[PDB]
Design a protein around this ligand. Structure first.
Ligand SMILES: NC(=O)c1ccc[n+]([C@@H]2O[C@H](COP(=O)([O-])OP(=O)(O)OC[C@H]3O[C@@H](n4cnc5c(N)ncnc54)[C@H](OP(=O)(O)O)[C@@H]3O)[C@@H](O)[C@H]2O)c1
Ligand SMILES: NC(=O)c1ccc[n+]([C@@H]2O[C@H](COP(=O)([O-])OP(=O)(O)OC[C@H]3O[C@@H](n4cnc5c(N)ncnc54)[C@H](OP(=O)(O)O)[C@@H]3O)[C@@H](O)[C@H]2O)c1
Lengths: 303, 305
C-alpha cells in the first residue's frame, strides 16, 4: 500500500463521486488532502445533491489523513487564486493535484445529435468540464512545480485508445472527455522540465452515489441491479480509481507515465491494488471484448 | 486539374471576414457557389479583432469571383443570431450544401511559449470560447438544414493534422486545446451525419500568407519572398486561396464521403485533387515542418512545393 504521509494533495471537485473517493483513498494512505467543491452544509450546488464538501474532508481525516475543506467555485478565478494562496500559506508545497471537476452528469443527453441536444446545457457542460481544469492548472501548478516530483492527475471518461475509436454519448460530452485527455498530454510537456508528471486517468463503470440511486440499490446489494442492467456486472466502487491515484502518487518512478492516458483497471493490473471487494474490474477491455462484441453480460476474466 | 463546378450549390462560411474564412468563401464563389459569409466586422463597427477588413467586402469579393456572396453580420457566440442566420438560409434557399466552420478569432489572444500558469488566463479562456463554442453553436443551428437531404458537407477548420498534433505540443495550452477539439469535432460530426448521407472533415491550411501574417512580416503578397531573409522557413508558405481551393475540391467531389471523419491538410488535398495555389505551386507545410525544419535542416522548399 502506498505511503503518502507528509504529502500534500488537492482534489479539485471532491464533494462526491470519484472526487470524494480519490480524496479519501489519498487520506487512507496518510496524505493531507485539500478538497474543494460548491456544496456546503449551508448551500446546495447546481447539482442539487446532499453530499457536502465538509463531509468529504471528515471522511479523509477519518480514513487516516487530514481533510481540509475549501468551498470553491472552480469557474471563479478569484476563488481558485485564493485556494492556491492558502495551500502555499499553510503547507508551502503541493505534491499531487487531481483535477476531478465534472459537474455535467445531469446536463448531457444520451443519443441526441448536436442539433437535438439542448444547446445551453451543452455549452454549460463544456465550461464546467474544461474551463475548471484550465483555471485550476493556471493557479495551482506554480506551487506544484516549485520542486521536482509533482504529479497532476486529469480525470476523464475513457482511454485515448477507446475514445479514439468510439463516439462518446453525444457531442458536448465527447468534446470534454477528449479535451481532458489532451490536457494530460499538454501538461506533461509543460511539467517535464520541472520534474513534474501529468497523466489522464479514467475510472471504469463507477458505482457512484448518483449511479446507485438511479439503479435503486445501495452499495451493499449492488448486484440486485443486474436483472435491470446486466452489463453492470463489470462495475467498480469509486474507491478503485481512488486507489489508482494513490498508487500513482506513491510511485517513486511515476514519471514513466508522463503524458499517458491510463485507466483504473489498467493500473490495478500494474500496481496490484484491488477494489474494496478484492476484485480488479477491467471496464474498457470488457466493453470492447464482451458488450460491444454482442456477447451476453459475463464478468469472467474481466474482474 | 479543372476547377470544380459549384453552380447551384449553397454554402455558408462562418467567420469569413478575413484570413482563411474570406479566401474559402471567395474560392467557393469562384467555382460558382452562392456563399453566405458571416463575421462581426461591418462597415460601421469594428470587431474585437480591431481590423479593417469587413464582412460586406468579403461578400462583394465572392460575387466578383463569379458567385453570389450574401453578408450576414453575426456574432457566433450569440445563439439567437445564429438561429436567425439558419432561418434566413432556409427562407432564401431551402437548402444548405456546404458548411465551413472557420471562426477562430484567437490570433491576438494566444501567447507563444508560455506555460499554462504564465499565460494570461482571461485571454486563454476567451480564445477557447471563441474557438470552440462558436463551432458548437453553428453546428447546432445549421446542421438540420444541411441533413435535410443527403450529400451535405461540413468542414471544420483547425491548425494541424491529427498526425502532426498527436505528436506535437501546439504553441501553448489554450491554443492547443482548441485545435485538438476541432479535430475531434470532425470525428464526432462524421458519426452524427453519416446516417443522413452527410460528410464531416477537419481541414488545416499550411503556413498562410494571411493579411495579418503579411503585415507582421512587413511585406505584401506581391513581394512576400522579401521576408525570407528574416524568416527563412517562410519559404513553405501558401496563400489563403490554397486552402480555399481545398474546400472547393471537397465540395465538388461526388465521392467526398470517402473522407468522412478524417483530418486533412490543404497540401495533402492539393496532391489528391490536383489544384494548385495561385502561383501554381503545391506547398506541403506539415511534411516540410517535420522533414526539414524540425530535423534541423536549413530552410529549403525543394520537394515540398
Ligand atoms: N456517476 C459518475 O459520476 C461517473 C460515472 C462514470 C464515469 N464518470 C467520469 O469520472 C470522472 C470523475 O467524475 P465524478 O464522479 O467525480 O463526477 P462529479 O461528481 O460530476 O464531479 C465531482 C464534483 O466536482 C464538483 N464541481 C462541479 N462543478 C464545480 C465548480 N464549478 N466548482 C467547484 N466544484 C465543482 C461537484 O460537486 P459540487 O456540486 O459540490 O461542486 C461534483 O460532485 C468524470 O470525468 C466522469 O465523466 C463519472
Ligand atoms: N498561418 C496561419 O495563420 C494558420 C496556419 C494553420 C492553421 N490556421 C488555422 O486556420 C483557421 C482559420 O483561420 P482564419 O485565418 O480564418 O482565422 P481568423 O481570421 O481568426 O477567423 C476568421 C474570422 O472569423 C471571425 N470571427 C471570430 N470570432 C467571431 C464571432 N464570435 N462571431 C462571428 N465571427 C467571428 C473573425 O472576423 P470578425 O472579427 O469580423 O468577426 C475572423 O477574422 C484557424 O483555426 C487558424 O488557427 C492558421
Amino acid at each position: 500500500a502506498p505511503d503518502l504521509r507528509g504529502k500534500i494533495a488537492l482534489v479539485a471537485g471532491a464533494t462526491r463521486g470519484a472526487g470524494r473517493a480519490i480524496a479519501v483513498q489519498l487520506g487512507a494512505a496518510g496524505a493531507t488532502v485539500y478538497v474543494t467543491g460548491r456544496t456546503t452544509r449551508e448551500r446546495r450546488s447546481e447539482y442539487n445533491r446532499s453530499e457536502t464538501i465538509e463531509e468529504t474532508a471528515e471522511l479523509v481525516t477519518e480514513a487516516g489523513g487530514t481533510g481540509i475543506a475549501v468551498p470553491t467555485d472552480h469557474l471563479v478565478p478569484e476563488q481558485v487564486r485564493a485556494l492556491a494562496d492558502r495551500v502555499d500559506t499553510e503547507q508551502g508545497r503541493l505534491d499531487v493535484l487531481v483535477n476531478d471537476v465534472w459537474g455535467g452528469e445531469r446536463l448531457f443527453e444520451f443519443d441526441k445529435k448536436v442539433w437535438e441536444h439542448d444547446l445551453d446545457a451543452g455549452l454549460r457542460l463544456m465550461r464546467l468540464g474544461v474551463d475548471t481544469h484550465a483555471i485550476s492548472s493556471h493557479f495551482l501548478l506554480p506551487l506544484l512545480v516549485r520542486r521536482p516530483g509533482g504529479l497532476v492527475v486529469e480525470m476523464t471518461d475513457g482511454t485515448a485508445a477507446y475514445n479514439g475509436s468510439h463516439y462518446r454519448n453525444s457531442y458536448f460530452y465527447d468534446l470534454v472527455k477528449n479535451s481532458v485527455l489532451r490536457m494530460g498530454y499538454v501538461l506533461a510537456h509543460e511539467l517535464e522540465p520541472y520534474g513534474g508528471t501529468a497523466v489522464t486517468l479514467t475510472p471504469g463503470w463507477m458505482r457512484s452515489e448518483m449511479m446507485l440511486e438511479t439503479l435503486g440499490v445501495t452499495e451493499e446489494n449492488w448486484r440486485d441491479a443486474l436483472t435491470e442492467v446486466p452489463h453492470f456486472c463489470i462495475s467498480e466502487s469509486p474507491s478503485y480509481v481512488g486507489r489508482a491515484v494513490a498508487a500513482l502518487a506513491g510511485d517513486a518512478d511515476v514519471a514513466r507515465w508522463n503524458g499517458q492516458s491510463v485507466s483504473s483497471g489498467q493500473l490495478a493490473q500494474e500496481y496490484g491494488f484491488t477494489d474494496l471487494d478484492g476484485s480488479r474490474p477491467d471496464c474498457w477491455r470488457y466493453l470492447v471484448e464482451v458488450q460491444e462484441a454482442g456477447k451476453p453480460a459475463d464478468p469472467s476474466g474481466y474482474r
